């Protein structure tokens, strides 16, 4: 996949928090943040899959991935 939605990230940044002034390409920075967050998710979930030696990512690996990376990606 070679895309990054201009409209969706702006709509999310406005829906979730109504009071900001995200800059001209600040939503592009938000997309980069989510791209790298999902990078960390993919790689550490691959690590989680190798932890239980499961050849398919499942729910029990993603929930363990979340509490590590999502907490780590908190500012």
């Amino acid at each position: 996949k070679r895309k990054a939605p201009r409209g969706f990230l702006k709509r999310v940044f406005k829906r979730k928090k109504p009071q900001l002034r995200l800059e001209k390409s600040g939503d592009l920075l938000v997309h980069l943040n989510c791209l790298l967050f999902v990078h960390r998710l993919a790689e550490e979930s691959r690590t989680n899959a190798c932890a239980s030696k499961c050849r398919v990512i499942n729910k029990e690996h993603v929930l363990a991935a979340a509490k590590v990376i999502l907490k780590k990606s908190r500012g």
């Binding site: 996949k1 070679r2 895309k3 990054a4 939605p5 969706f8 990230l9 999310v12 940044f13 979730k16 928090k17 900001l20 002034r21 995200l22 800059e23 001209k24 390409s25 600040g26 592009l28 920075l29 938000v30 997309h31 980069l32 943040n33 989510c34 791209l35 790298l36 967050f37 999902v38 990078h39 998710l41 993919a42 979930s45 691959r46 899959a49 398919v56 990512i57 499942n58 729910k59 690996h61 993603v62 929930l63 979340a66 999502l70 780590k72 990606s73 908190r74 500012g75």
Partner: protein, 99 residues
């Protein structure tokens, strides 16, 4: 939509088949990711004293996420993942008219 964009990009980022039931939970992970981010941009932009969220307002946040370092600055991180027509907006090129 965009969450569906990221779960599809997860497929080409995990390099490995997963389950749809995994994807709606990673959807809640992205929702909480924004539920931490947009108020982390909130508090970081308030820390700078500026109403708007300038690019350096997020460079500090990504320093917090450990992805910006003295070795890996903000702009280099744009090289590795964003497409050219998108990083043309972010990292200043030069025409004697640097963006």
């Amino acid at each position: 939509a965009g969450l569906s964009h990221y779960v599809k990009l997860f497929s080409f980022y995990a390099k490995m088949p997963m389950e749809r039931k995994a994807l709606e939970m990673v959807e809640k992970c992205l929702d909480k990711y924004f539920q931490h981010l947009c108020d982390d941009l909130e508090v970081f932009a308030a820390h700078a004293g500026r109403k708007t969220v300038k690019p350096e307002d997020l460079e500090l946040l990504m320093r917090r996420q450990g992805l910006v370092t003295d070795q890996v600055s903000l702009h280099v991180l744009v090289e590795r993942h964003l497409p050219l027509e998108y990083r043309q907006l972010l990292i200043p090129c030069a025409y004697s008219g640097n963006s």
